[PDB]
């Protein structure tokens, strides 16, 4: 009170000095059920992968994507992102994801990169200089390789011009190594562009076949259907907590509600447009949001020339939520309630007055 009045002596009276707050104790985040998962099992772990001149493009959209399972997997020998962060894939949202799957040699795994120049980069699969997304690659020597040699995986060796980014070329036109005319007829200086790989189990690390899946993100004006997973916590009721329900955040006491919502309605508002009712997204139940018990802290004292005894009034605060007496004005601590009636010395409110004789109310 001396701090509030900017004086070392306090006259007899009641002085509003501070503002009692019920501090939030927990944080409750309730987010709806993580269903309709993206089909990453049929892209990363499919039956047969495609060649690199005819790489399979899978469109990931209208689903929720759990990149934490993909990132925490130890089978992947290469997980390199060029436009995003691996730890923020579960937080960001994208319109759609293009998954480009193919098989290359182990020494050509570095060639799927922006600014990298190679045969696979120029003739088989080209990335732009402003590429966003992540390239994932893992060894597949136990599956793709055959003791007689797996010749099913072809790759383009010759083309007149370099690729545009995200361009396919499945054409089988005979290349002209020299300047002799070739009408599709092979000769001394005219060769077929698609050659087969030499995947065998006796080769070392670098010649083993590597399966590569490249995820590319689009951030167009289409709505962001692809988002990360939502980790909803448990629900705590009857306490002043910080609630986060489907992006609607606030602070309040969450109690059971008798308001019966219609099934299309999610939140509830009073006359003054304040959210006082809400539906939990996990379990379809209705909760009232009572604001925490904020109050004004008033100090009831006589003069400091008389005595240093004080009483504290918490305005509009019940005595179970803070010589303790409950008034209609609030909870009064430090004053002894008496049954006698006197004239009002220090006004408390609602017919209650305080006086010094100790402090009585």
């Amino acid at each position: 009170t001396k701090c509030t009045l900017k004086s070392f002596t306090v006259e007899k009276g009641i002085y509003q000095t501070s503002n009692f707050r019920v501090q939030p104790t927990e944080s409750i985040v309730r987010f709806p059920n993580i269903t309709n998962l993206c089909p990453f099992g049929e892209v990363f772990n499919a039956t047969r992968f495609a060649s690199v001149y005819a790489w399979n493009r899978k469109r990931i959209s209208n689903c929720v994507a759990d990149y934490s399972v993909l990132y925490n997997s130890a089978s992947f020998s290469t997980f390199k992102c060029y436009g995003v962060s691996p730890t923020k894939l579960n937080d960001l949202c994208f319109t759609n994801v293009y998954a480009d799957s193919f098989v290359i040699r182990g020494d050509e795994v570095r060639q799927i990169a922006p600014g990298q120049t190679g045969n696979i980069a120029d003739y088989n699969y080209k990335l732009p200089d402003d590429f966003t997304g992540c390239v994932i690659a893992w060894n597949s020597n136990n599956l793709d390789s055959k003791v007689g040699g797996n010749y099913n995986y072809l790759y383009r060796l010759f083309r007149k011009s370099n690729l545009k980014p995200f361009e396919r070329d499945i054409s089988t036109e005979i290349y002209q190594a020299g300047s002799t005319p070739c009408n599709g007829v092979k000769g001394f200086n005219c060769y077929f562009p698609l050659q087969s790989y030499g995947f065998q189990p006796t080769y070392g690390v670098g010649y083993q076949p590597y399966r590569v899946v490249v995820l590319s993100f689009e951030l167009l004006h289409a709505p962001a259907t692809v988002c990360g997973p939502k980790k909803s916590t448990n629900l705590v009721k009857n306490k002043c907590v910080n609630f986060n329900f489907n992006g609607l955040t606030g602070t309040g006491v969450l109690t059971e509600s008798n308001k019966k919502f219609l099934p299309f309605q999610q939140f509830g508002r009073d006359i003054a447009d304040t959210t006082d009712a809400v539906r939990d997204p996990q379990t379809l139940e209705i909760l009232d949001i009572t604001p925490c018990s904020f109050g004004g802290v008033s100090v009831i004292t006589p003069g400091t020339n008389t005595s240093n005894q004080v009483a504290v009034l918490y305005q509009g605060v019940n005595c179970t939520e803070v010589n303790v007496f409950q008034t209609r004005a609030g909870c009064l601590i430090g004053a002894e309630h008496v049954n006698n009636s006197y004239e009002c010395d220090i006004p408390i409110g609602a017919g209650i007055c305080a006086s010094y004789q100790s402090i009585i109310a």
């Binding site: 509003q16 939030p24 602070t251 304040t274 604001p291 904020f294 109050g295 004004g296 305005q315 509009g316 209609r328 004005a329 009002c344 006004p347 409110g349 609602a350 017919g351």
Partner: protein, 120 residues
Amino acid sequence: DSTECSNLLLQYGSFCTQLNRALTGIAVEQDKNTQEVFAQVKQIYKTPPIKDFGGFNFSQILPDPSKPSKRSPIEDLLFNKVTNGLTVLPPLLTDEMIAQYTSALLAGTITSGWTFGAGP
């Protein structure tokens, strides 16, 4: 509850103190207004139990003993006909004590004339 907002609000100084002090002045002015209007007598007068006033009937303005609020029928009809940091402070005088003050004024002006307003 945003702490960054309050840190930016401290740059504007004592605007909030002025608003709170003006509202506190209004709040104590309302209680002073009620005190000046109704508490004009320091003696709580009662009517006699026998209402023999020479044919004059005051039952519609005297308090009804059957009602728990101790209001007159006219006062009861009057009370029936009236229907984020925000707090409402209760008034210092409750409606029962304002009704008691009006009952004392009615008993004084019925039993004692204008003499109770100028002395005994």
